[PDB]
Design an enzyme around this catalytic site. Sequence first.
Site, PDB file in Angstrom:
ATOM      1  N   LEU A 167     -46.215 -22.292 -33.557  1.00 13.23           N
ATOM      2  CA  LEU A 167     -47.075 -21.794 -32.493  1.00 13.23           C
ATOM      3  C   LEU A 167     -47.741 -22.994 -31.837  1.00 13.23           C
ATOM      4  CD1 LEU A 167     -48.733 -18.655 -34.158  1.00 13.23           C
ATOM      5  CD2 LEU A 167     -46.889 -18.664 -32.473  1.00 13.23           C
ATOM      6  N   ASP A 168     -48.758 -22.732 -31.024  1.00 14.69           N
ATOM      7  CA  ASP A 168     -49.488 -23.804 -30.365  1.00 14.69           C
ATOM      8  C   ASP A 168     -50.936 -23.365 -30.178  1.00 14.69           C
ATOM      9  OD1 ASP A 168     -49.270 -21.954 -28.340  1.00 14.69           O
ATOM     10  OD2 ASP A 168     -48.314 -23.294 -26.897  1.00 14.69           O
ATOM     11  N   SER A 169     -51.643 -24.095 -29.316  1.00 16.35           N
ATOM     12  CA  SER A 169     -53.047 -23.802 -29.050  1.00 16.35           C
ATOM     13  C   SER A 169     -53.236 -22.412 -28.455  1.00 16.35           C
ATOM     14  CB  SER A 169     -53.614 -24.875 -28.122  1.00 16.35           C
ATOM     15  OG  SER A 169     -52.933 -24.856 -26.878  1.00 16.35           O
ATOM     16  N   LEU A 170     -52.395 -22.030 -27.496  1.00 17.46           N
ATOM     17  CA  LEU A 170     -52.614 -20.789 -26.764  1.00 17.46           C
ATOM     18  C   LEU A 170     -51.941 -19.584 -27.409  1.00 17.46           C
ATOM     19  CD1 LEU A 170     -53.814 -19.501 -24.200  1.00 17.46           C
ATOM     20  CD2 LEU A 170     -51.702 -20.066 -23.018  1.00 17.46           C
ATOM     21  N   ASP A 171     -50.885 -19.789 -28.196  1.00 14.46           N
ATOM     22  CA  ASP A 171     -50.237 -18.662 -28.857  1.00 14.46           C
ATOM     23  C   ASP A 171     -51.086 -18.116 -29.998  1.00 14.46           C
ATOM     24  OD1 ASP A 171     -48.001 -17.981 -27.446  1.00 14.46           O
ATOM     25  OD2 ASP A 171     -46.619 -19.228 -28.609  1.00 14.46           O
TER      26      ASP A 171
END
Lengths: 74, 670, 60, 80, 98, 68, 17, 85, 73
Positions: free
Chosen positions: H40-44
Amino acid sequence: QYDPPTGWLWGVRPGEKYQNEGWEGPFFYGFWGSLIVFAIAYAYKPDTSIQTWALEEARRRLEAEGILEDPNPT
Amino acid sequence: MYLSIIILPLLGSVVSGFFGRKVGVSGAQLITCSSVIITTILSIIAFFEVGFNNIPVTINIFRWIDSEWFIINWGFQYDSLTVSMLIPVLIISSLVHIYSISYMSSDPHNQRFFSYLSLFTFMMIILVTANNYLLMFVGWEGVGVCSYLLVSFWFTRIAANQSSISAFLTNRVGDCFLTVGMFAILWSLGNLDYATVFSLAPYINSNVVIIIGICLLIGAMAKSSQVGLHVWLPMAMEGPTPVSALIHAATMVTAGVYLLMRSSPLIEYSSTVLLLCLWLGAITTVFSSLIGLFQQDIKKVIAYSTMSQLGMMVLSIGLSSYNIALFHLVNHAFYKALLFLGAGSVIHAVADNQDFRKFGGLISYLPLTYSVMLIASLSLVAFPFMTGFYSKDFILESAYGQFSFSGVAVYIIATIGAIFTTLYSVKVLYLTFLSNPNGPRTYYRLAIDNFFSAQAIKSYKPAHEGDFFLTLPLVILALFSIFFGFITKDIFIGLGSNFFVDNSLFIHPIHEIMIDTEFAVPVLFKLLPFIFTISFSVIALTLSELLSELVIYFKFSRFGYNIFGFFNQRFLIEFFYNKYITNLILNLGGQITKILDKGSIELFGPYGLERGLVKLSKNISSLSTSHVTTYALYILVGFILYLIYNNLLLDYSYLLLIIILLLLLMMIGE
Amino acid sequence: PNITGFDMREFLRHTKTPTYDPWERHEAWRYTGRFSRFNRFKGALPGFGIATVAFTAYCV
Amino acid sequence: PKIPYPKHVWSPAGGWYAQPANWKQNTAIFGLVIFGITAMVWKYSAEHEVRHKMPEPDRFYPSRYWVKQIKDYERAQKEK
Amino acid sequence: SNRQAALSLYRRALKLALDWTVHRNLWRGQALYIRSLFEKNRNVTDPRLQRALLKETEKLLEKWKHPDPYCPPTAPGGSKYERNLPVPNLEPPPPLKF
Amino acid sequence: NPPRIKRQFRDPHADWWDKQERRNFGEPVHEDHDILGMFSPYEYTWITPGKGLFQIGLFIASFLGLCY
Amino acid sequence: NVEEPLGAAFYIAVGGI
Amino acid sequence: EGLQKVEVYERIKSLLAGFDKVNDPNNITETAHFANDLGLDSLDTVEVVMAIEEEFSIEIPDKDADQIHSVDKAIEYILRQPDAH
Amino acid sequence: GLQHYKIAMDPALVRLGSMISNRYKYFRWTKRTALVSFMYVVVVPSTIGYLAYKTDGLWDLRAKRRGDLISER
Ligand SMILES: CCCCCCCCCCC(CCCCCCCCCC)(CO[C@H]1O[C@@H](CO)[C@H](O[C@@H]2O[C@@H](CO)[C@H](O)[C@@H](O)[C@@H]2O)[C@@H](O)[C@@H]1O)CO[C@H]1O[C@@H](CO)[C@H](O[C@@H]2O[C@@H](CO)[C@H](O)[C@@H](O)[C@@H]2O)[C@@H](O)[C@H]1O
Ligand SMILES: *P(=O)(O)OCC(C)(C)[C@H](O)C(=O)NCCC(=O)NCCSC(=O)CCCCCCCCCCCCC
C-alpha cells in the site's frame, strides 16, 4: 437471566440493622398517629359548611317553583 | 364496569412501579399487561353498551373543587365519543404492552418502563372520560408528565434530556392557553361541566365563544403538534420505540383533536375558529410531508407522518365534520402503530441503526416485517379499499365538497401533502427492504455461506425476524389496516347515521357538507388522489434503482442543495426558536441576575446605603478632636445659628435645605 | 478559479459505476443473487401472486 | 451482556435486573389485591352508574346483570 | 502538520460523498474521482502553497456539507449513545451519618 | 473570562476528564458556564439567520402564490 | 436466589385501604 | 460473549483482500504492516480504516487513525472498543 | 458541622461561585447599565401598570348572551 433484588434500604448493610436516632417514636406514634386518629374523628365531626345549609333552603325555594317536585303536596 | 375501566390500569402501574422489587420483571409485565387486556375487554363491551344502544352513563364519585359557583366533580361521563375514543387507546396500549415484553427484554430498568406506559394508559382514559374540562386537564397534564418520563427514560443520555424538556415545556405553552380558556369558560358560565357549557353555548356572546375557542385551539395545537407548537413531537422519538407507537403516534397526540371534537357544541357557534381549524391543519399536513421526505432517520419520518395525518384531523374539524375526524383519528391509530412497531422490529434486527443509509435488501431478511409495513403504508397513502382509504380520502372530498374558497384552497394544499406522503412512504419502504444493501456484512451475512473457519457457531447474526411477543401485535394490527375501516364506515360516516345522537359530536345544519360531498363533487376529483398516488409512487421507484442519478444531480445542484437543507432542517423553525425565544429568555434572566438583582438594586439600596453611610459617619467622627476650644467653637456656631433661625423668622425649608446641604458636604471627602 | 482541481460538473460526470476500481472484490457481494435487481423485487408484493389465482377462481 | 451496577442501591421499582426468587408467589398476592379492590370499584360503580335510557330486553347489554338502576327497572317492569 | 491534516480531509471528503449519495454504487465512482485529486497534487512542495491548498478544500467541505451526516448509533451523536451508561463509582458509600 | 462558546463545539473524541460534559477538571469556565454546557439549547449551525429568514420567505411567497 | 418479603409498606398500603 | 480474536482476524482478512492493489492475498498475516509487509502507500492505507470503520459500524477519530498502520494494531484496536458489533 | 462526602472540588467552579456571590460589590452606574436599570425597573412596570389602569372595569364575561357586549365602559 435476571438478578435478585438488592440494595441497602436506609443505607443499612445486610450484616447490620437500622438504629433508632430518637425521632422515630415521637414521629410515628405522635405526629402520624395523631393525624390518623384525627382522620377517623373527622368522619364524625358534624357538617357545618355554608353550602349544606344553603342547599337545604335553596331546595325549598326551587321546590316552590316548577323545579324539584317536592315529596309533599302540602 | 365504568369505574373499573378507569381504575384498573392505575393499579398495574402502582404495583409495577412501587413494588416492582417484589413482583420482579415477569410479574410486573404480567400484572400491567393483564390490567390493560382486561380494561380493553371492558371498553369493547362499553362500546356496545353506550354506542350501539345510545345509552350514555354518568358516574359522579365525589366533588373535587367546591368554591361558590364552581363545583368541579370527580365524575365520568361515557358517551358515543368516549367509547369510540377508548377503542384505539386501549387496543393499541394492549399490543404495545405485549410488544414491549420482547422489545425491552434487554433494558435493565424494566419495571419502571412497564409502570410508565400503564400510567400513560390511566391518564388517557381520565382525559376522555371526564365530565368537565378541569378533570379532563388532569389527564392532559398527566399525559405530558408520562410522555416526559418516557422521552427521558434513558436519562443518562443528554439528547433524551433535551428532548424531554422540549416536550414538557412546549406542551405547557398550550396548557397556558388551555388554562386561560377554561378561565374564560368559568367567567362567562360559572362552571365548566360539558352539560352546562354545551347546553348554553348557542345563547352566549359570539365574541366570548371566539375567545374561548381560540384558547382551545392553541392548547389543541400544542398536544396535536400543529404547525406552530410542533417541535416537541419529532424530539419525542428519543424514547424507546414502543413509547413512540403508543404515545407519539396513536394516543397522546390525538388528545388535541379530541378536545375540539368534544368542544364541538361550543365551537360550532363561531365560524372563526372553524376557519382557523381548516387552515391550521392544511398548513400542517403539507408542512409535515415536505419535511418527512428529507429526513434520514426512520422514526423521524414516521413522527412527521403522524403530524400530517393530525393536520388532516384538524382540517376536517374545520370542515365541521367531526365524524370524519373521529373516523380518521381511529383509523390512523391502527396503521401508524403498525408502522412504528414494524419499524421498531427493523431497528431491533440491525444493531439499533436508525439511518436509511445503512439498510436495504432486508426484504429477504424481514419477510413479515416488510409485509405488515407495506400494508400499513397503503392504508397511510389511502390505497383504495383499505382502512386508511375510507377515512382520509373522504376528508379531501369533504374539503372540496364544502364549495368555498378555503375548502377548495386546502384541497389543493392537502393534495401536495398527499403527493409527498407517497414519496416518504416509498422512501421508507424501498430503502429499508427493496434497495441494494447499504449496511455492513453483519446485517446480511447468512449461515448458508461458510465464510468462517473456527467461529462458525457465532458472528453470523444476519438480521433475523422477531419472536412471538414482537410479531403478534404486528399481525393483529395488520388485520385492522385491511378491514377495520370498511366494517365501521357506517358508524362514523354513513349518510344519516345516528351514532352520536347524545349531542356528543354536534354539527349545525347551516354548514353541513355531507350531501354535496357525495353528490356535487365531480368523479375525477373524488378519484384524483388515487391517480396522484400511483403516478408519484412509480416515479419514486423510477428515480431510485431505475434512473437514480437525477436525485444525485439535484442534491448537488446549487438550488436543490439549499432546499434539501431547508426541509431536512425542518423549515429552520427550531433554529429560530432557540436563538430568538429560549436564548432570549435565557439572556433576559442574565440581565436581571447580574445587572439588576446583583447590581443596581444592591447599589441603589442596601449596599449603596451601607457604603455611603459608613463614609458619612466617619467624616462626622472626624469633627471629634477632644479639643475644648474646637468644641467651644462648635457650641458657639450652633448657638448663633439657633438665633438666626428664630430671630430672622426664616422659612423652615431653608433649615431643611441647610441640613441636607451639610450632609452633602460631610459626604464629600475632606 | 478553484486552485484545487475540483470541478463540480466533473464530480457529477464521475457519478456512475466505475469500469475499474480497487474495491469490487469486497463490494461485489451487494449486487449478487440475494440482492439482484430481480430477486430483490421477487417479493415486493408478497401475497399478490396467490391472491390473483384465488380471485380468478372465485370469479369463475 | 449485562450492565454492571451497584449492589448497594435500593430501588422500589426493583433496580437493574431485579427478579425475586418468589416473583410468582408475590405476583399472586398482588393480583388478588388488585382483583379485590377492583371488585369494590365494581360494586360502587354498579350502585351509582346512572342512566336515562333503558336497554331493550332482547339486546346484548351485560351491564343489566349488576347495575342496580336498571336491575330494579327490569323487575319493576315485570309487574302487570 | 501539513501531512496529517491532508489525510484527514480525504476521509471527510469520502464521508461527505456517501452522506449525500446514499447509493454505494455511485459513491464508488465519486470516491475514485476524489483519490485522483489527492494524487494529482502529491508533489506540491512549497509550504506556502500547501497551507493555502489545504485551506481552500476546507471551504469545499463546508460549501457542500450535509444537513445531517451519518453517525453510528454508539458514536457520539448516534442514536444509542450514552443510552444505558453505568454508574462511574461502583464502590459502596463510606460509613457516614446524615 | 474565556471565549463564550457553547461546549457543543468541542471534540467529542478528545481526552476529557468529563467526557459527557467535554471538559477538563482544571479548565477555566465562563460566567455563563450554566448555559454553555452540553445540557443546554442546541446551536443549529446550518445557515446564518439572515439567509434563513430569506428561505422561509420564499415558502411564504409560494404559499401565497397558490392562494392567488 | 434471595427471596423478597412483601414488606411493611405492602401492609401499610393494603391495611390503609 | 463479545468480539473475539478469531472473529476479528477472519473478518478483516476478507476485507483487505478486496483491494486490487495489495501484493498478494498470501502476504497478509497478524503482524503484517500496511506499508513494509504488504503493498500500500500513504493514501491507500487511510482508505482501509475508512472501510474497517464501515464494516465494524464504528467511528475512527482522526487522532487514533494514524497510529493504526499494521494489521495487528487493527486487531487490538477493535477489541479495545466494546461498541463494535 | 458534620462531615460530608469527599467532593472533587473544581477550583474553577468554586471561583465562579465566589465571583457570582461577590458580584454586587463591583457594580457601577455606567451608560449602558442605567438604560438597563431604567428599562426593567421603570418603563416595563409603568407600561404594564398603565395598561392595567386603562382596562380596569372595561370587560366582563359573567353571563353575556347574544345581544349584550363584553365591554362595560
Ligand atoms: C388571542 C386572541 C384574543 C382575542 C380574540 C378575539 C376577541 C374578540 C372580541 C374583542 C373585544 C372584547 C375583548 C375581551 C377581552 C377580555 C377577555 C380576555 C380573555 C381572558 C378571559 C374587544 O373590545 C374592545 O374593542 C376595542 C376596539 O373597538 C375597544 O378598546 C378600547 O378602545 C378605547 C375605547 O375608549 C380605549 O381607549 C382602549 O383602552 C380600549 O382597548 C373597545 O371597543 C373594546 O374594549 C370585543 O370587540 C367588539 O367589541 C364591541 C364593543 O366594544 C365592538 O363591536 C362593535 O360596536 C360598534 C362599534 O363600536 C358597532 O356599531 C357594532 O356593530 C359592533 O358590534 C367592537 O369593539 C368589537 O370589536
Ligand atoms: P499519501 O498520498 O497519503 O501522501 C500525502 C502527501 C504526503 C503526499 C501529502 O498529500 C502532500 O505532501 N501533498 C502535497 C501538499 C499537500 O499537503 N497536499 C494535500 C492534498 S491537496 C488535495 O488533495 C486537494 C483536493 C482536496 C479534495 C477536494 C474535494 C473535497 C471534497 C468535496 C466534497 C463535496 C461533497 C461531496
